[PDB]
Amino acid sequence: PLDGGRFATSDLNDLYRRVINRNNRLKRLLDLAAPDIIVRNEKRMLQEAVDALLDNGRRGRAITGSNKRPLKSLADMIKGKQGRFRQNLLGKRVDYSGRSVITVGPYLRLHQCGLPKKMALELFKPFIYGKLELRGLATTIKAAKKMVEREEAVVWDILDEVIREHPVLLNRAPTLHRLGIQAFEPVLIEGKAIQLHPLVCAAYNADFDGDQMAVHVPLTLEAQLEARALMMSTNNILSPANGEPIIVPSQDVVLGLYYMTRDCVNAKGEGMVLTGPKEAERLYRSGLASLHARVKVRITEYEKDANGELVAKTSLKDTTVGRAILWMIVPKGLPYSIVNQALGKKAISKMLNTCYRILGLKPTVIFADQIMYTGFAYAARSGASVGIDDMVIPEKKHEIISEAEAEVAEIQEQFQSGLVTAGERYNKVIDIWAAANDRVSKAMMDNLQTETVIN
């Protein structure tokens, strides 16, 4: 039915009607002894009508309706991307699902996503009915419904009770590779944005400029056991495309670590000796030494011995205050040399990989979380920022460009004297411009990259 009491007829009904009509006409022309050519015309029309019914548009001009569109025959209900096979048999719409705009949450552990309270209430409303009747607070489904729609805070207590171990699935369209769907143990936040852990967000190929994400809740207990054992993000550390880890930091985390490990030739408190990394942290936080200052520190490390024991060693090493601070979080078993250099993205990647090979899964997970926290905090304290004076323009550039244009004029006038073909003139001009551009780039990099300071 339609508004105003009208009805939308499915095109199949119209095709059926037409075929019925033609059949009735042919039978009437037969039973009243029509002439030959008339019944031949009627039966040819009937055959054409059957062709339209099954596969309209398969031959000749397609049938069309008042909208001047071709009617969808039975065959069109199975062919094509709108067909029954692709649309419904695969790719079903599903109950117990929601969608929301995502958002960074840095305070989350690795395996827990921040889920808005309203969505949680809506999704788990059946479970809430169940537990509310089970605990005897509500007697009938009507009572449960009216209670939950009034949000009597006891419903909020029940809701906090239900989800405590109940993993949910997060999905980002398009699900390019299987990492696109992952399992998380929810945490309840007021607001309306789903909060992710940035590390896995890097794996999602997602960003935060307004990307939406969909959440599904498993129903059965076998299903949630599967979600926990297989899909939980604490398991998907290694990509399937290659052995290297997928959980790798980027942006502020890497910037913070890089700043934390970079040393300078002269800084506050250079050359002093620290009896332990804790004292390095103290001297930094008390403000008597800057992170970049180089210092000797007593440090203990461990190695997996031939038997499998973490045999200890302790020694004095030259390092930086920042490097000692970072080392303090490193779990037992990794060698100190891993830290004692300017840490880039690739260095952190290989550090995570070597952690995962040397030690088990869980120390690597804890190491990842600690890395994320410390990197963010020290990046914030760093206060790195970009200013217009930073993009220094190498003053050589004007000279180099004048040289290049002089050569361009020279080759152009050489062509003006007819000494060369135009194509080779073009080639020469292109070559000299490329050479000049490379020279300018080298000058810019040389001027920017290094600077002089007093010792």
Binding site: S97, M119, P218, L219
Partner: protein
């Protein structure tokens, strides 16, 4: 000098380049084309008159009677625009046409008339464009996008062998009419020439050539060049042009002047050609092999027998040569085949043709075009003739004629719209020349080749369709019956015309729904250009080459503004200065160069002419004499940039900004940032939402004034004067004495659109921005609109921004916001939603609106009146009833045992059920307006009668207040005329105003003026009473509504929405960001003076996106407010105004060689104080797009502001109280809210409705459906071993009509069992496959 109004907030320009041409009226194309469509025209060139004359008159032969057209006129639109928008009726006016019917006598001459009848036909209703350039269709605003399509004419095109792939090149030339069949001509890998009609088939070209009245020998004589040979006994002569020798190899000795000389086996070169030319050779003697291998040009006859031995296109058979030579026909004619210059292609076509004669080709063409029917000579002839040469079935419009001739280099510019024989043969010759290589194919993507078709052309096309349908109806009426006893009023049916025009305006792909987020968005949508639509192009078939930029886009189409995604390239925006040539080609202004001095005259060019000349780059520096400083001035010409001397330059760009549209032009510092990010920012700027309170942007572009005034939202001073009165909603202005027309009241009034639903649910509000007694000037802005302040565009807001990573809350473009922003309602926005309630005559009695609702608490009903309508002003929340409506449920018979079961249960199982309208879930707000519309003959309820009473009272008070104001103006004019002389001011003062108007102070023209205004007063009171009577009948009259509805009720709900984490905000340079945290104001970083930062952005995005310009913007912001802060303090200390005056003069002088040059010495001190009051909040800075502020000027401005010269400052972290070691960039930035609020997207469904056929859950937020587990996600699950969750996803959660019930039961019971049945969609598939006639069934049950 500045107008007095503009003295408020004189924005500081920085542009160095002067401006020689003001930006044109931005909407001009739409308004002027529609005017051209509707306005009267005696010449019948365009619009209604042209359309009518293109069909009329109409003549009947057996009827011996004629229908002919006198004139057309457009009636009055019965409803005003706001009434149309309120009541939902299309804004239209009646089309009236004067028509005459003629009958002649039944004797020669047929022209002897005997009777004439004339009357006016109401042949249709037509929409009118509103003053803002938008149409009003039903209840909606709609604006027609001007299309850009391939021009009619002829084009020449080649593919780089892609089709055949052997490496050759193939050519085709195509002719496109304005309407009618296409023709295209094509070569072949076998070098045959083929012709095709509407791309039907592929046929040799000779078919048409003989279909045209030409025989084979005529064809050869026309297309090819002929050579003559003579035979005498067995000696052979040929007649030669020496140049004809060029190209061949002299394998045999060749004779001239009686001497024979050839280097055998060698190619004839220019020395040989010159030798023969100086020899002046005419006829030479050649061997038999030379004439061998030559084609027979024509038939040859032997008179000794009356026999023919030579045919057309035949090779030279030596036997035939001997026979004809002995017969006596010693002369022979042959063609010439230069392997490069004179390809034998036509001859090969003549060989391969199946046809033999004109009628054979005609019937073959007919059977090609009309398969499945027996050919007939008349049928084929009629088909061909009417197809190409019936000026009504086919027509190259005049633009088609111009392009056709100009591509064929013919002198003529005009001609008949139908083709001809010479046209076809000429285009074929041109294609042959192209195949020879003495030419070049055409470039269709070139902008001198595509054409802009505006609304007028589409409107007249649809109206012509209506006219031809009506013409068929009229000729049918003429044929069917008598001619005397009827009037053409009945002969013409308006039905087809109205159907066609309404179908165009409602349905058509180019009649797209308008967007109204902000005035800029409305402007850019009106101006937008689309390549799609009727006769256009499809997103699937659009290759890269049409999308890509073409070098003649410069100055005509903005390259930046294109939308992103699959539509890219196919949608564009007019550049700011571009205007349409009468032929629809784009046109750009330029400045004439005259011997090194720019004349400053303006000339308009199209892509062809621009390509022909040399035009200088805009940024070229000049002296005051007009001579360029540099001799080697850089310029562009013929699609390439280079350097040229001062004298070679022909034209100069008008202004720097002429390459970009308005949308890009608004962005400051555009010259400093990448194109991708600039594009994204330009597009995003359209989506901005108007805030609760407008704010100026500090770093603007000057364009804001023009855009704000040109859009329709702001009320502009149409007549200068002094503002007499202002309130929240009305403006009354006294027109000055000189400006007012004689007999006018001298007072004008404006009424502001106080609150209404925008087309995207945003608010639309107009706020006055003047005060009593302030002078106002022609073109001043009296009332601001949405996102407008003092007549400047005010999309965004000014925020204090620090660039610094902060604890990951700004990770990956995330934005962190200080709570102070929320507390000040800086980004709070007002939204309006409209809800409709429809009452219908349901089964077992109507469904009625009422407050008598079953099974509901009375407290909710108390919010409603006794009629069942909420009182305006009541707050309402999700799930509550706004209006009560009730549906009968039919009989609902209960057996007596069920009757007693119901009785013990209660009042349940009622035959009457609630249907009342309910608040959408999660929405809450306040109820601002209620509307009712009801069918005639039904009683008006309490709510209906009360609102009708209030509305009629409103109309009465409005009309009476208009009367009072205008009569006060009239009597003020009485005073002004009477004081002029012969005064009796006190003697009149004792008398009441009626005496003043009645009495005569003199006997002269003054008394004539008094009598004139008294008659004016009588006329205005009579028109006022007539207007109020019409208004009252118009209010009291019922409405048509729709079928079956008794009455509709609409209620208006308004909601205030607030910035919240998950909301998306973005800055003009295109750096989107989701707000991810609000912060207690204490925690935000704060500078040395203790004022906190407001918004913290991640810096890491800047180098990788290359949005360097935005950083510069930030710096300028820190400078701008700097001055503001200082001047604010300088005001707060309440010092002498002269000191701040000199300071302001310094601040304006600060620029170097800036065009501004404003001086305060002419300003009186109260004006200076007003200026300071507006400048207290910062000094707005104007930076043109490509002549913007330089870094040196920025530094100087900062230095005058006492801020750090680098723009970086020290900063303290509030959360610990320590100091960041690095300096940080803190400044001011302009930010927008992007209308993607989180509460519009968050959605969740536990369970709900289910679809009918597939039994799957519904889709979409509105239906409260669930998300779609697409096939990619299914593959993702398959990649894991997670079988069980997949099975649960498919069977139980989605499609099992019983399994999900079992699951719901077990979950409620607390048992997480599962039972997978069968997906019902599988049974659906089985039934459809079986219905197809294919047996499919399960096995092993």
């Amino acid at each position: 000098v500045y107008s007095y109004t503009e003295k408020k907030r004189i924005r500081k320009d920085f542009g160095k380049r002067p401006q020689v041409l003001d930006v044109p009226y931005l909407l001009s194309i739409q308004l002027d084309s529609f005017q051209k469509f509707i306005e009267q025209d005696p010449e019948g060139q365009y619009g209604l008159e042209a359309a009518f004359r293109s069909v009329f008159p109409i003549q009947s032969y057996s009827g011996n009677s004629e229908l002919q057209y006198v004139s057309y006129r457009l009636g009055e639109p019965v409803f005003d625009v706001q009434e149309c928008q309120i009541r939902g009726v299309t804004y239209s006016a009646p089309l009236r046409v004067k028509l005459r019917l003629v009958i002649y006598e039944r004797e020669a001459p047929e022209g002897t008339v005997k009777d004439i009848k004339e009357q006016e036909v109401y042949m249709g209703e037509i929409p009118l464009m509103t003053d803002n350039g938008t149409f009003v269709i039903n209840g909606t605003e709609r604006v027609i996008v001007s299309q850009l399509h391939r021009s009619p004419g002829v084009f020449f095109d080649s593919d780089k062998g892609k089709t055949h792939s052997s490496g050759k090149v193939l050519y085709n030339a195509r002719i496109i009419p304005y309407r009618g069949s296409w023709l295209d001509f094509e070569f072949d890998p076998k070098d045959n020439l083929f012709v095709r009609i509407d791309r039907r088939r592929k046929l040799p070209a000779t078919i048409i050539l003989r279909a045209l009245n030409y025989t084979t020998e005529q064809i050869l004589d026309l297309f090819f060049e002929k050579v003559i040979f003579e035979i005498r006994d067995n000696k052979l002569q040929m007649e030669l042009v020496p140049e004809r020798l060029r190209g061949e190899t002299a394998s045999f000795d060749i004779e001239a002047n009686g001497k024979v000389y050839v280097e055998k086996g060698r190619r004839i070169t220019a020395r040989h050609i010159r030798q023969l030319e100086k020899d002046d050779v005419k006829l030479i003697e050649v061997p038999v092999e030379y004439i061998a291998g030559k084609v027979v040009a024509k038939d040859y006859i032997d008179e000794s027998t009356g026999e023919l031995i030579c045919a057309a296109n035949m090779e030279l058979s030596l036997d035939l040569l001997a026979k004809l030579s002995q017969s006596g026909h010693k002369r022979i004619e042959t063609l010439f085949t230069n392997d490069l210059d004179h390809g034998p292609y036509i001859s090969e076509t003549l060989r391969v043709d199946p046809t033999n004669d004109r009628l054979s080709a005609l019937v073959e063409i007919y059977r090609m075009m009309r398969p499945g029917e027996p050919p007939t000579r008349e049928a084929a002839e009629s088909l061909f003739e009417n197809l190409f040469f019936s000026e009504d079935r086919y027509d190259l419009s005049a633009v088609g004629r111009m392009k056709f001739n100009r591509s064929l280099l013919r002198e003529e510019i005009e001609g008949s719209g139908i083709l001809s024989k010479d046209d076809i043969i000429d285009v074929m010759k041109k294609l042959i020349d192209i195949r020879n290589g003495k030419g070049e194919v055409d470039d269709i993507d070139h902008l001198g080749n595509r054409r802009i078709r505006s609304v007028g052309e589409m409107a007249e096309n649809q109206f012509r369709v209506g006219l031809v349908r009506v013409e068929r109806a009229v000729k049918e009426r003429l044929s069917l019956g008598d001619l005397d006893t009827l009037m053409p009023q009945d002969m013409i049916n308006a039905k087809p015309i109205s159907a066609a025009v309404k179908e165009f305006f409602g349905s058509s792909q180019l009649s797209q729904f308008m967007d109204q987020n902000n005035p800029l968005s409305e402007i850019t949508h009106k101006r937008r250009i689309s390549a799609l639509g009727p006769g256009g192009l499809t997103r699937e078939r659009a290759g890269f080459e049409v999308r890509d930029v073409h070098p003649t886009h410069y100055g005509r189409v903005c390259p930046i503004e294109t939308p992103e995604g699959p539509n890219i390239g196919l949608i564009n925006s007019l550049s700011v200065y571009a205007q349409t040539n009468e032929y629809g080609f784009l046109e750009t202004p330029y400045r004439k160069v005259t011997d090194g001095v720019v004349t400053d005259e303006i000339h308009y060019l199209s892509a062809i002419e621009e390509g022909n000349y040399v035009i200088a780059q805009a940024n070229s520096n000049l002296d005051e004499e007009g001579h360029f400083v540099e001799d080697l001035v850089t310029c562009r010409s013929k699609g390439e940039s280079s350097l040229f001397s001062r004298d070679q330059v022909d034209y100069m760009d008008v202004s720097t900004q002429q390459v970009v549209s308005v949308g890009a032009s608004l962005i400051p510092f555009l010259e400093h940032d990448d194109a991708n990010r600039a594009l994204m920012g330009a597009n995003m700027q359209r989506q901005a939402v108007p805030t609760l309170r407008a704010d100026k942007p500090l770093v603007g572009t000057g364009m804001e004034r023009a855009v704000a005034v040109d859009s329709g939202v702001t009320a502009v001073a149409k007549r200068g004067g002094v503002v007499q009165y202002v309130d929240a909603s009305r403006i009354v202005i006294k027109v000055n004495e000189d400006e007012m027309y004689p007999g006018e009241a001298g007072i004008d009034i404006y009424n502001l659109t106080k609150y209404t639903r925008s087309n995207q649910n945003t608010c639309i509000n107009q706020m006055p921005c003047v005060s009593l007694g302030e002078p106002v000037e022609r073109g001043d802005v009296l009332a601001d609109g949405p996102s407008t302040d003092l007549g400047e565009l005010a999309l965004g807001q000014n925020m204090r921004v620090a660039f610094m990573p902060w604890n990951g809350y700004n990770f990956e473009d995330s934005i962190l916001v200080s709570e102070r922003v929320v507390q000040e309602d800086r980004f709070t926005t007002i939204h309006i939603q409209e809800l409709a309630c429809v009452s219908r005559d349901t089964k077992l009695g109507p469904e009625e609106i009422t407050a008598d609702i079953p099974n509901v608490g009375e407290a909710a009903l108390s919010k409603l009146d006794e009629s069942g309508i909420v009182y305006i002003g009541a707050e309402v929340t999700g799930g509550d009833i706004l209006v009560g409506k009730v549906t009968p449920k039919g009989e609902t018979q209960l057996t007596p045992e069920e009757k007693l079961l119901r009785a013990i249960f209660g009042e349940k199982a009622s035959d009457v059920k609630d249907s009342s309208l309910r608040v959408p879930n999660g929405v809450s707000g306040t109820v601002i307006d209620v509307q009712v519309f009801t069918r005639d003959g039904v009683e008006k309820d309490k709510r209906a009668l009360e609102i009708e009473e209030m509305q009629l009272k409103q109309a009465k008070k409005d009309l009476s207040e208009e009367l009072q104001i205008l009569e006060a103006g009239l009597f003020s004019r009485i005073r002004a005329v009477l004081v002029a002389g012969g005064v009796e001011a006190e003697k009149l003062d004792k008398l009441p105003r009626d005496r003043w108007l009645e009495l005569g102070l003199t006997d002269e023209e003054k008394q004539n003026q008094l009598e004139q205004l008294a008659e004016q007063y009588d006329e205005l009171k009579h028109e006022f009473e007539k207007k109020l009577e019409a208004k009252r009948r118009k209010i009291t009259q019922g409405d048509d509504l729709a079928p079956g509805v008794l009455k509709i009720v609409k209620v208006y709900l308004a909601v205030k929405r607030r910035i919240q984490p998950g909301d998306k905000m973005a800055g003009r340079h295109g750096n989107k960001g989701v707000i991810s945290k609000i912060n207690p104001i204490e925690d935000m970083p704060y500078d040395e003076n203790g004022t906190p930062v407001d918004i913290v952005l991640n810096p890491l995005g800047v180098p990788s996106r290359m949005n360097i310009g935005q950083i510069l913007e930030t710096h300028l912001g820190m400078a701008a407010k700097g001055i503001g802060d200082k001047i604010n303090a300088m005001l707060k200390q309440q010092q002498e105004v002269a000191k701040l005056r000199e300071f302001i003069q310094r601040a304006y002088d600060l620029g170097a060689d800036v065009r501004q040059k404003v001086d305060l010495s002419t300003f009186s001190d109260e004006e200076v104080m007003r200026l300071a009051e507006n400048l207290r909040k910062g000094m707005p800075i104007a930076t043109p797009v490509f002549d913007g502020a330089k870094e040196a000027e920025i530094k100087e401005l900062l230095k005058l502001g006492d801020l750090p010269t680098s723009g970086q400052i020290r900063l303290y972290d509030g959360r610990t109280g320590e100091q960041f070691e690095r300096p940080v960039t803190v400044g001011y930035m302009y930010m927008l809210k992007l209308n993607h609020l989180v509460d519009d997207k968050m959605h969740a469904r536990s369970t709900g409705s289910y679809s009918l056929v597939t039994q799957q859950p519904l889709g979409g937020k509105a239906q409260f459906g669930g998300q779609r587990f697409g096939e990619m996600e299914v593959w993702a699950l398959e990649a894991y071993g997670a079988a069980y969750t997949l099975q649960e996803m498919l069977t139980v959660k989605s499609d099992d009509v019983n399994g999900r019930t079992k699951m719901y039961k077990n979950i409620v019971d607390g048992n997480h069992q599962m039972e997978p049945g069968m997906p019902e969609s599988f049974n659906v598939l089985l039934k459809e496959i079986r219905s197809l006639g294919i047996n499919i069934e399960l096995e092993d049950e």
